[PDB]
């Protein structure tokens, strides 16, 4: 029967991030035995904490025999956000598009980006490389997949608890800033929401001094988190601009129509809603614009009117997450702009 008696320590609280693993994958993820995957995960977490501005939650790993021996699952708050296979004794050969040829093993697709690839035996490692393929080991596949997911759900992985944690970290470097800012001027809720909207659109939040000072300035006369988000953005323009347009190069961007922005801008006032027809119009055209830029080699950046950006981003992104939506009040003052793509009368 159930040897010991049941207690409250038998209640398992859900995890922010977690991974379920087949039994063949227990070795790499093993605690005792330096878990090959464990260290990769530590690396991934640190890199996120230094590039994005916040430590992702610990990844809770537990085996689950109902799963295929080599399968693994990645969960967020208990729900599956990803899953794949990884065969220990093997290596994965992924084609970047460049390399050519075919190899033995099992045919599949890189979990992250989604490139064709093949699973091969330890032996053929060399050939796979001479033939061009990028060769990584089983544990690495998983780390790559996990890293892709943390990036993708970076906004959701950032909760009230992480907000507080960041706030504490900032306090221990700039005591002044924080101290009397929250719950005083800004509430944790508003802080958390603003920071989330920033991560939501890939804007790093490492520059807390700028963000906190900007809120300290406007919070008093503006409490809407959506509003504050817009302000903090321009306040961060030098970073945002430099992010997608490194160096003193020329800023090649996508632009919408002049009559179109009137269409949108007008309906913006009348009710916080939107009407069909137009919906699919944009989504369609836009998709085409990305490709023009794609072919050209320029960033998937769409520069548009300030009052627009908010709903134009939250609209075209819940479809084309790959698209960046900057405001004209965000792009740096002294940059050479060239609207090298549009959304006109075709």
Swiss-Prot record:
Keywords: Bacterial flagellum biogenesis, Bacterial flagellum protein export, Cell inner membrane, Cell membrane, Membrane, Protein transport, Transmembrane, Transmembrane helix, Transport. One of its GO terms (cellular component) is plasma membrane. It comes from the Bacteria. The chain holds residues 347 to 692 of 692 of the full protein. This is Flagellar biosynthesis protein FlhA. It is a multi-pass membrane protein. Belongs to the FHIPEP (flagella/HR/invasion proteins export pore) family. Required for formation of the rod structure of the flagellar apparatus. Together with FliI and FliH, may constitute the export apparatus of flagellin. One of its GO terms (biological process) is protein secretion. It is found in: Cell inner membrane.
